Amino acid sequence: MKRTWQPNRRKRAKTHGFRARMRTPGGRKVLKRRRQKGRWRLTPAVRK
Amino acid sequence: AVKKFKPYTPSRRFMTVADFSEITKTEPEKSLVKPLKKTGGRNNQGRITVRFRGGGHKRLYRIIDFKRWDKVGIPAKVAAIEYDPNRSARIALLHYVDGEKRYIIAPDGLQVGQQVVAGPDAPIQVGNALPLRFIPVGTVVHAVELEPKKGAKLARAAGTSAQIQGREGDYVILRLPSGELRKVHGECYATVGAVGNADHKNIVLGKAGRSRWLGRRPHVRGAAMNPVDHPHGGGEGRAPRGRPPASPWGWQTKGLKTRKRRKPSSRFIIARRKK
RNA sequence: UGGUUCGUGGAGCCAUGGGGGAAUCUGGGCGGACCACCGCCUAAGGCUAAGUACUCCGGGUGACCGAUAGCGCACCAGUAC
RNA sequence: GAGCUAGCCCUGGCCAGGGUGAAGCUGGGGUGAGACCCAGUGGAGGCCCGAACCGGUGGGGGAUGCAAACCCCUCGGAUGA
RNA sequence: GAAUGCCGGCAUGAGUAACGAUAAAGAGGGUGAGAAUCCCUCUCGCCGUAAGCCCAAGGGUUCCUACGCAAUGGUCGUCAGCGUAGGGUUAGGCGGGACCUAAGGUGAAGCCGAAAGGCGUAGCCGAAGGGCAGCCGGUUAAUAUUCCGGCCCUUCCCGCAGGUGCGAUGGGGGGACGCUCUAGGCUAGGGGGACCGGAGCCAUGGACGAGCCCGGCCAGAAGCGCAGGGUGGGAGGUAGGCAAAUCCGCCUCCCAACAAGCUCUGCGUGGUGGGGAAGCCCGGGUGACAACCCCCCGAAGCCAGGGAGCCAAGAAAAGCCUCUAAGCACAACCUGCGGGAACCCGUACCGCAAACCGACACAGGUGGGCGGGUGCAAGAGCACUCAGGCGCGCGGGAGAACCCUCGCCAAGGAACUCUGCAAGUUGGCCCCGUAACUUCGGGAGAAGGGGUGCUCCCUGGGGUGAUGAGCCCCGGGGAGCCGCAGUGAACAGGCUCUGGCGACUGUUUACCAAAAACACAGCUCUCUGCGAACUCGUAAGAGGAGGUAUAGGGAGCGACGCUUGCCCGGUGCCGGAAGGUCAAGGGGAGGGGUGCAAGCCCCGAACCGAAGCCCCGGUGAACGGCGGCCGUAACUAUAACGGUCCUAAGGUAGCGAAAUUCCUUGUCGGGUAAGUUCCGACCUGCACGAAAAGCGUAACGACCGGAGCGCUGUCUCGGCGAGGG
RNA sequence: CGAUGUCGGCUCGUCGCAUCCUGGGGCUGAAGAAGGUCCCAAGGGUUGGGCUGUUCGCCCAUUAAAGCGGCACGCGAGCUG
RNA sequence: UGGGAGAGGGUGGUGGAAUUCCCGGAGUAGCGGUGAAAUGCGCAGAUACCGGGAGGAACGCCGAUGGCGAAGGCAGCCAC
RNA sequence: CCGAGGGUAGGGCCCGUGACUGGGGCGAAGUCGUAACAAGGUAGCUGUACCGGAAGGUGCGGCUGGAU
RNA sequence: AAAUG
RNA sequence: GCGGGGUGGAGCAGCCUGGUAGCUCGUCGGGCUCAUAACCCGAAGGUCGUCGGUUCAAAUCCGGCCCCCGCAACCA
Ligand SMILES: [Mg+2]
Ligand SMILES: [Mg+2]
Ligand SMILES: [Mg+2]
Ligand SMILES: [Mg+2]
Ligand SMILES: [Mg+2]
Ligand SMILES: [Mg+2]
Ligand SMILES: [Mg+2]
Ligand SMILES: [Mg+2]
Ligand SMILES: [Mg+2]
Ligand SMILES: [Mg+2]
Ligand SMILES: [Mg+2]
Ligand SMILES: [Mg+2]
Ligand SMILES: [Mg+2]
Ligand SMILES: [Mg+2]
Ligand SMILES: [Mg+2]
Ligand SMILES: [Mg+2]
Ligand SMILES: [Mg+2]
Ligand SMILES: [Mg+2]
Ligand SMILES: [Mg+2]
Ligand SMILES: [Mg+2]
Ligand SMILES: [Mg+2]
Ligand SMILES: [Mg+2]
Ligand SMILES: [Mg+2]
Ligand SMILES: [Mg+2]
Ligand SMILES: [Mg+2]
Ligand SMILES: [Mg+2]
Ligand SMILES: [Mg+2]
Ligand SMILES: [Mg+2]
Ligand SMILES: [Mg+2]
Ligand SMILES: [Mg+2]
Ligand SMILES: [Mg+2]
Ligand SMILES: [Mg+2]
Ligand SMILES: [Mg+2]
Ligand SMILES: [Mg+2]
Ligand SMILES: [Mg+2]
Ligand SMILES: [Mg+2]
Ligand SMILES: [Mg+2]
Ligand SMILES: [Mg+2]
Ligand SMILES: [Mg+2]
Ligand SMILES: [Mg+2]
Ligand SMILES: [Mg+2]
Ligand SMILES: [Mg+2]
Ligand SMILES: [Mg+2]
Ligand SMILES: [Mg+2]
Ligand SMILES: [Mg+2]
Ligand SMILES: [Mg+2]
Ligand SMILES: [Mg+2]
Ligand SMILES: [Mg+2]
Ligand SMILES: [Mg+2]
Ligand SMILES: [Mg+2]
Ligand SMILES: [Mg+2]
Ligand SMILES: [Mg+2]
Ligand SMILES: [Mg+2]
Ligand SMILES: [Mg+2]
Ligand SMILES: [Mg+2]
Ligand SMILES: [Mg+2]
Ligand SMILES: [Mg+2]
Ligand SMILES: [Mg+2]
Ligand SMILES: [Mg+2]
Ligand SMILES: [Mg+2]
Ligand SMILES: [Mg+2]
Ligand SMILES: [Mg+2]
Ligand SMILES: [Mg+2]
Ligand SMILES: [Mg+2]
Ligand SMILES: [Mg+2]
Ligand SMILES: [Mg+2]
Ligand SMILES: [Mg+2]
Ligand SMILES: [Mg+2]
Ligand SMILES: [Mg+2]
Ligand SMILES: [Mg+2]
Ligand SMILES: [Mg+2]
Ligand SMILES: [Mg+2]
Ligand SMILES: [Mg+2]
Ligand SMILES: [Mg+2]
Ligand SMILES: [Mg+2]
Ligand SMILES: [Mg+2]
Ligand SMILES: [Mg+2]
Ligand SMILES: [Mg+2]
Ligand SMILES: [Mg+2]
Ligand SMILES: [Mg+2]
Ligand SMILES: [Mg+2]
Ligand SMILES: [Mg+2]
Ligand SMILES: [Mg+2]
Ligand SMILES: [Mg+2]
Ligand SMILES: [Mg+2]
Ligand SMILES: [Mg+2]
Ligand SMILES: [Mg+2]
Ligand SMILES: [Mg+2]
Ligand SMILES: [Mg+2]
Ligand SMILES: [Mg+2]
Ligand SMILES: [Mg+2]
Ligand SMILES: [Mg+2]
Ligand SMILES: [Mg+2]
Ligand SMILES: [Mg+2]
Ligand SMILES: [Mg+2]
Ligand SMILES: [Mg+2]
Ligand SMILES: [Mg+2]
Ligand SMILES: [Mg+2]
Ligand SMILES: [Mg+2]
Ligand SMILES: [Mg+2]
Ligand SMILES: [Mg+2]
Ligand SMILES: [Mg+2]
Ligand SMILES: [Mg+2]
Ligand SMILES: [Mg+2]
Ligand SMILES: [Mg+2]
Ligand SMILES: [Mg+2]
Ligand SMILES: [Mg+2]
Ligand SMILES: [Mg+2]
Ligand SMILES: [Mg+2]
Ligand SMILES: [Mg+2]
Ligand SMILES: [Mg+2]
Ligand SMILES: [Mg+2]
Ligand SMILES: [Mg+2]
Ligand SMILES: [Mg+2]
Ligand SMILES: [Mg+2]
Ligand SMILES: [Mg+2]
Ligand SMILES: [Mg+2]
Ligand SMILES: [Mg+2]
Ligand SMILES: [Mg+2]
Ligand SMILES: [Mg+2]
Ligand SMILES: [Mg+2]
Ligand SMILES: [Mg+2]
Ligand SMILES: [Mg+2]
Ligand SMILES: [Mg+2]
Ligand SMILES: [Mg+2]
Ligand SMILES: [Mg+2]
Ligand SMILES: [Mg+2]
Ligand SMILES: [Mg+2]
Ligand SMILES: [Mg+2]
Ligand SMILES: [Mg+2]
Ligand SMILES: [Mg+2]
Ligand SMILES: [Mg+2]
Ligand SMILES: [Mg+2]
Ligand SMILES: [Mg+2]
Ligand SMILES: [Mg+2]
Ligand SMILES: [Mg+2]
Ligand SMILES: [Mg+2]
Ligand SMILES: [Mg+2]
Ligand SMILES: [Mg+2]
Ligand SMILES: [Mg+2]
Ligand SMILES: [Mg+2]
Ligand SMILES: [Mg+2]
Ligand SMILES: [Mg+2]
Ligand SMILES: [Mg+2]
Ligand SMILES: [Mg+2]
Ligand SMILES: [Mg+2]
Ligand SMILES: [Mg+2]
Ligand SMILES: [Mg+2]
Ligand SMILES: [Mg+2]
Ligand SMILES: [Mg+2]
Ligand SMILES: [Mg+2]
Ligand SMILES: [Mg+2]
Ligand SMILES: [Mg+2]
Ligand SMILES: [Mg+2]
Ligand SMILES: [Mg+2]
Ligand SMILES: [Mg+2]
Ligand SMILES: [Mg+2]
Ligand SMILES: [Mg+2]
Ligand SMILES: [Mg+2]
Ligand SMILES: [Mg+2]
Ligand SMILES: [Mg+2]
Ligand SMILES: [Mg+2]
Ligand SMILES: [Mg+2]
Ligand SMILES: [Mg+2]
Ligand SMILES: [Mg+2]
Ligand SMILES: [Mg+2]
Ligand SMILES: [Mg+2]
Ligand SMILES: [Mg+2]
Ligand SMILES: [Mg+2]
Ligand SMILES: [Mg+2]
Ligand SMILES: [Mg+2]
Ligand SMILES: [Mg+2]
Ligand SMILES: [Mg+2]
Ligand SMILES: [Mg+2]
Ligand SMILES: [Mg+2]
Ligand SMILES: [Mg+2]
Ligand SMILES: [Mg+2]
Ligand SMILES: [Mg+2]
Ligand SMILES: [Mg+2]
Ligand SMILES: [Mg+2]
Ligand SMILES: [Mg+2]
Ligand SMILES: [Mg+2]
Ligand SMILES: [Mg+2]
Ligand SMILES: [Mg+2]
Ligand SMILES: [Mg+2]
Ligand SMILES: [Mg+2]
Ligand SMILES: [Mg+2]
Ligand SMILES: [Mg+2]
Ligand SMILES: [Mg+2]
Ligand SMILES: [Mg+2]
Ligand SMILES: [Mg+2]
Ligand SMILES: [Mg+2]
Predict the structure, then answer these.
(1) Nucleotide closest to residue B138 (CA–C1')
(2) Of A45, A47, A36, A48, whose CA–CA distance to A17 is shortest?
(3) What DSSP letter does each residue of A1-48 carry, written as one string?
């Protein structure tokens, strides 16, 4: 049966991407929250 | 002049289609078309503002000249009559002696190859457009500018027409297709005659398919829903309304006058619509 | 309408969205409706250190913990997953 | 968070084969002229039988399963919403 | 010591369930300490519109080589998608970018919002759309249209010659399009051949044969040829294409019009360049100087922007062509030749799966192309099979019960059971033949019969060719042969009668309901005159709609047929410059506080004062409602009539123990040996009823009842046999 | 109530006696045959079908007779639903 | 051949009287209706009277015991 | 080969029959109305249409077989 | 106005 | 189980708020008619379901019983 995860590299980058985060005050806060916690990757990775 | 079909399929029993008799050209004029962006009933926000629309066959919009006072006193030969999927009216292609080409709505009885012209001194002849004050009272007319130099807004649907009942001051009095009587300014241009394709209302669709082809998505009753969705919803088994029939939003749908009262156009309306 | 202890209360005072709209000291505001007396202070321009607040950072010290405790992590942790 | 699901918009792709035989057109008959009748050509349709493809009617098995919805037989639509 | 406590650890169940499809295995020979599991060979089975091959998405070194087996692999393991190390991805022409735009996103201008921010024309981004120049062959353990060989091609820069008013982000043309059917001519591909090439083979009773088996092509510049696409030529006038303009458009004249010509492709040929088997011998070598031809079938693909028909009326920008403007004409553009230049990223491998999405090497899910041969009417169906790929990563024994899945049965044939649930029967093509009823299409494949294999003779027609032969495609008649059975295996409807419901194909509770529910054309009401009504948003702004009452929103009913009665008292809506009511405000009679006072401050009647409400009316396809008790006919029984209280007004037509009937298995009739269900009637309708529509209706239904035939392991009633456990 | 699965049917039984048959009797308004009522007696037996979800019941065709009841209205870690 | 009559028929166009409804002026205690009343209407300003507008239907006198058509039927006026 | 006939299947016409139902026919003195023959007390009738316990009433149009 | 025998 | 009702012969007022029973038809008597109905003028008839209680006094207010309709009987 078709499951919930059908990966698409263009989508993952346009939706959760870094340039997407910067464009909204929410997403900007998303980055600030992750840096303070000290995560190693602020954005999901994708090879493009 | 509608055509029928033998009932060789159950949906084809009652279907009817237009004869397409007056149509002289199978394809439009390239220079006069542009893309009609299908809205799907959704606005710039993305929300649906009008339910149950979209999914219709793809169409190319055909530019219409709702301002014939543009080219005053320059005649034109009726080149052809084409089919427009963007309105109920047939349209007619015009080749001006000026060389420019334009579409106008095709009035009834307009035959290809005749002269049409617009101007205060233009003859009273089907197809010619004049300001209202220069049109004999009583004559049929259509494609009426509501206000001067703002584009024809009235009497554009298939077979519609507007009549002239008299003049008062700068304004003239019309009987709109709805029956309403309204003072319209004389300087508003208007095309004489009645809109063509009068048999449009006798088209029997035939099946749910043709509802979709035109872009009409299925419309579901209110009583077939649930409380959160519609006022009529819910109820064990089938059920009557149980309240004054109300729109999905609460305001009643049985004879509730919606027009704003203090609208300044009230001064210029003489008689509310008839029937 | 808001602030003040003040929830329309006798409800001033400070601030103010709408309306009407003065004076230049013999001008003006306040002393809890309002009046008089007697007093206080000069609105509608602006700046001003020190005394106060916090602890990512450095140090000192614990009748603070001692690897299920103590920061989630004494160890390659905001990692594996 | 619409990479599942629901709707819409932009742009591409797919639907073996077979059967039925609408209108129209040509001829002939007919009539004052017509309607109309018959044979032929014609190839319409949310038409029929039926793969792919999209479904999930009935039964059985599976029930710590191959599987947090599957497998077998059977069954519906299959040029159209 | 307990909180189905938290964390961790070790037991129990238990050597029990299970080892992930029942497509299947055996033997021999290698290596190794060790082998059913690794490798080589022979034999056997499995898919073959794939379980084969090529892409795209996703995955990220899993590809190749060497060396290894603690763990990973549902057992083992020398093996591997695992561990270690080395190696491996080559492009002007394939794809993407330095070109274009679509939804959409962003957004100079501009608008909006407490802040954050939200809109918005031009512009810009945005592709699996448009546009764009490479085909075949070889080679590596691994890459190749990328390296190599042969034959082609594009753009840019410079130089040169020839030609011309050159020049663009501005004008115009073109790009440029739907669904169904479809002509002609080719190619892909396929079949045959006594013709050409070939190593061989004679078996086991026959065959030295016109015998068997293998193979008989691919690409190709200019030119040529066949087949199609596209486009008329000149002159004059011009006010339109937001400047100009010879271009375009419009008008007039002249010549040409299925043409011809000019132009672009597609196929064939083409200098020339490669490929090239079975078999035998150890991936290579031979075969071989390999041959490379003829006939038939033939595309959904190519010519292509073909043609016809129809209604729902079928993208934009750029490249390309032309037109002119500043400018500039020592230039610049174009055509041709020569010499130079040509950058970034991707190329391995998996890719219907053990490497992707499902926690797993998971019986599930994943878009596009090719997908061969024979036969069965056909076909991507079924069966067998080529190339190619696998036997699904535990086996070996035994031959109990029991479950799963499958096969058979005496006599009976629904007695089973809630129900024929299930399993049988029927089954494809041909010809005869086919009822009520109907909306004239239908019902209808109704039903129900007969034929079907092979051989000999005779004979019609079509395609190809040429008109014949050859090959191919359709048939027709006569005489005969065999078997239990001739669509001899596999794929392939049981049928009929009568009700309720819904018109119909369709849609839904992904994941227990596919229905009688939703939707649907169609009917009716009602709203809206444009900056519409309505909707989203505080707004701006959008949608409505680049629509205009034959249009648009809202509500109910749901084809069509015949119809839809009475009540407007209450509620809702519509109408109603009177009156009554009514807050702010106006108004200020009249009072009060205080000051010596001028004055300051507060209370405050009548009267003037919108919508709304009361009040008068209208309105049912608006919300809703539509009586009781009593008497009476020359038998009885029942009341067509009458009496009386009440209502706003008292249920009309049609139907009715119904999807509704409590009493109920109402009563009568049918069908049955027997019928609480079903069917037809009756009517005292506990409690149908006319757009929450009423009564019907041909056709349709994996909907829900009742009946019959056919056939059956459903059953009396069980028995045997097969395979996986 | 940190679960005692609830009607009916199939399957499989087992018990009680207030016995329906069969056996042994008393009385009889018992002539015989055949019955009526009561006593003893539970060893064995107690059919098939129609309708309804039915238990019960009604009906058809038989029968020696077509008995009533208990075992969680026996029995769902056995099934049906 | 030449003439005559006629509501014979079909299409298009057109005239006034009257009825109802709306707007304006003026005006007030009833109008309307029957055998006689009542329902209705009317101070929220009706009837009656003046001016203006919209819309449909039928064609007074002429006209008749008349004319035309096969029949049903055909009547303002102009034209084809 | 034909063939009496027998079996199977589906049609056609006719006769009888059937819960129930529709009107109709007649049948000395049932009930309720009074529509027609007088201008029947609303002139009659007719075709058609809707409505009514019943005859009948009304609408449109036609006839005189209508009197004064 | 106004029925029936 | 809950609600309403019973009164001349029939169908209803009066009951709430005690003192007085009324409306229509019918029945009876007499009128008009040839006669009947219709119509006109008169007239009679009800101790309020029953029983008990309160009160000076009960159709009337309160209790018990009979009958008459009407509503409810739900989760299992
Ligand atoms: Mg997951
Ligand atoms: Mg997807
Ligand atoms: Mg992608
Ligand atoms: Mg780091
Ligand atoms: Mg958005
Ligand atoms: Mg919602
Ligand atoms: Mg609501
Ligand atoms: Mg409701
Ligand atoms: Mg409901
Ligand atoms: Mg209901
Ligand atoms: Mg509103
Ligand atoms: Mg406050
Ligand atoms: Mg308070
Ligand atoms: Mg207080
Ligand atoms: Mg305050
Ligand atoms: Mg100051
Ligand atoms: Mg200051
Ligand atoms: Mg601190
Ligand atoms: Mg510190
Ligand atoms: Mg310590
Ligand atoms: Mg220590
Ligand atoms: Mg710790
Ligand atoms: Mg320790
Ligand atoms: Mg530890
Ligand atoms: Mg978002
Ligand atoms: Mg989506
Ligand atoms: Mg395919
Ligand atoms: Mg086909
Ligand atoms: Mg097909
Ligand atoms: Mg075909
Ligand atoms: Mg065909
Ligand atoms: Mg056929
Ligand atoms: Mg044709
Ligand atoms: Mg013809
Ligand atoms: Mg035909
Ligand atoms: Mg044909
Ligand atoms: Mg089928
Ligand atoms: Mg089908
Ligand atoms: Mg799918
Ligand atoms: Mg679905
Ligand atoms: Mg299933
Ligand atoms: Mg199941
Ligand atoms: Mg499950
Ligand atoms: Mg199927
Ligand atoms: Mg079908
Ligand atoms: Mg479509
Ligand atoms: Mg304890
Ligand atoms: Mg537990
Ligand atoms: Mg426990
Ligand atoms: Mg063991
Ligand atoms: Mg055990
Ligand atoms: Mg075991
Ligand atoms: Mg085992
Ligand atoms: Mg199997
Ligand atoms: Mg071995
Ligand atoms: Mg193995
Ligand atoms: Mg990739
Ligand atoms: Mg090795
Ligand atoms: Mg292992
Ligand atoms: Mg490795
Ligand atoms: Mg190259
Ligand atoms: Mg560059
Ligand atoms: Mg761009
Ligand atoms: Mg700005
Ligand atoms: Mg911004
Ligand atoms: Mg934006
Ligand atoms: Mg492309
Ligand atoms: Mg390219
Ligand atoms: Mg490779
Ligand atoms: Mg190659
Ligand atoms: Mg090369
Ligand atoms: Mg020049
Ligand atoms: Mg030029
Ligand atoms: Mg252009
Ligand atoms: Mg062809
Ligand atoms: Mg072939
Ligand atoms: Mg060959
Ligand atoms: Mg050969
Ligand atoms: Mg040879
Ligand atoms: Mg031999
Ligand atoms: Mg062979
Ligand atoms: Mg060639
Ligand atoms: Mg040509
Ligand atoms: Mg020309
Ligand atoms: Mg010129
Ligand atoms: Mg010009
Ligand atoms: Mg110009
Ligand atoms: Mg020119
Ligand atoms: Mg030219
Ligand atoms: Mg070529
Ligand atoms: Mg050699
Ligand atoms: Mg040789
Ligand atoms: Mg050919
Ligand atoms: Mg194709
Ligand atoms: Mg093409
Ligand atoms: Mg074409
Ligand atoms: Mg555009
Ligand atoms: Mg551009
Ligand atoms: Mg110049
Ligand atoms: Mg590759
Ligand atoms: Mg698959
Ligand atoms: Mg594939
Ligand atoms: Mg694999
Ligand atoms: Mg495996
Ligand atoms: Mg798998
Ligand atoms: Mg996996
Ligand atoms: Mg093929
Ligand atoms: Mg094939
Ligand atoms: Mg074949
Ligand atoms: Mg054969
Ligand atoms: Mg197959
Ligand atoms: Mg093989
Ligand atoms: Mg594979
Ligand atoms: Mg494997
Ligand atoms: Mg056998
Ligand atoms: Mg048997
Ligand atoms: Mg047998
Ligand atoms: Mg039988
Ligand atoms: Mg039974
Ligand atoms: Mg049944
Ligand atoms: Mg069932
Ligand atoms: Mg079955
Ligand atoms: Mg029949
Ligand atoms: Mg027929
Ligand atoms: Mg048949
Ligand atoms: Mg044979
Ligand atoms: Mg019926
Ligand atoms: Mg029924
Ligand atoms: Mg349906
Ligand atoms: Mg479901
Ligand atoms: Mg509709
Ligand atoms: Mg209408
Ligand atoms: Mg708003
Ligand atoms: Mg707006
Ligand atoms: Mg707009
Ligand atoms: Mg509408
Ligand atoms: Mg409905
Ligand atoms: Mg209905
Ligand atoms: Mg109604
Ligand atoms: Mg009402
Ligand atoms: Mg009302
Ligand atoms: Mg109102
Ligand atoms: Mg006031
Ligand atoms: Mg004083
Ligand atoms: Mg008011
Ligand atoms: Mg009501
Ligand atoms: Mg009697
Ligand atoms: Mg009735
Ligand atoms: Mg009723
Ligand atoms: Mg009726
Ligand atoms: Mg129903
Ligand atoms: Mg019976
Ligand atoms: Mg019977
Ligand atoms: Mg039966
Ligand atoms: Mg039932
Ligand atoms: Mg009864
Ligand atoms: Mg009903
Ligand atoms: Mg009802
Ligand atoms: Mg109704
Ligand atoms: Mg019905
Ligand atoms: Mg119906
Ligand atoms: Mg019918
Ligand atoms: Mg029906
Ligand atoms: Mg269906
Ligand atoms: Mg059935
Ligand atoms: Mg069995
Ligand atoms: Mg067995
Ligand atoms: Mg076995
Ligand atoms: Mg427990
Ligand atoms: Mg329970
Ligand atoms: Mg005993
Ligand atoms: Mg005993
Ligand atoms: Mg006894
Ligand atoms: Mg005995
Ligand atoms: Mg005895
Ligand atoms: Mg019973
Ligand atoms: Mg029995
Ligand atoms: Mg027992
Ligand atoms: Mg019990
Ligand atoms: Mg059930
Ligand atoms: Mg079930
Ligand atoms: Mg003459
Ligand atoms: Mg007036
Ligand atoms: Mg009055
Ligand atoms: Mg009055
Ligand atoms: Mg005559
Ligand atoms: Mg015979
Ligand atoms: Mg015979
Ligand atoms: Mg009447
Ligand atoms: Mg009488
Ligand atoms: Mg009492
Ligand atoms: Mg008493």
Answers:
(1) G54
(2) A45
(3) ---S----HHHHHHHSSHHHHHTSHHHHHHHHHHHHHT-S-SS-----
Q: Which nucleotide is nearest to B166 (CA to C1')?
A: G53
Residue linked to tokens 């029937």? B275
Other Cβ atoms within 10 Å of A45 Cβ, number: 8
Identify how the structure was determined: X-ray
Helix locations, B30-111, DSSP H: none
Q: Which ligand is nearest to the CA of A47?
A: 57
Contacts 24+ apart (CB under 8 A), B51-55: B51/B217, B51/B219, B52/B216, B52/B217, B52/B218, B52/B219, B52/B220, B53/B215, B53/B216, B53/B217, B54/B215, B54/B217, B55/B212, B55/B215, B55/B217
CA distance B235 to B52: 24
Q: Tell me the H-state helices in chain B.
A: 208-213
| Cα–Cα distance measured from residue B15 to residue B28, given in angstroms and rounded to the nearest whole number | 27
Contact indicator for B39, B54 with CB cutoff of 8 Å:
yes
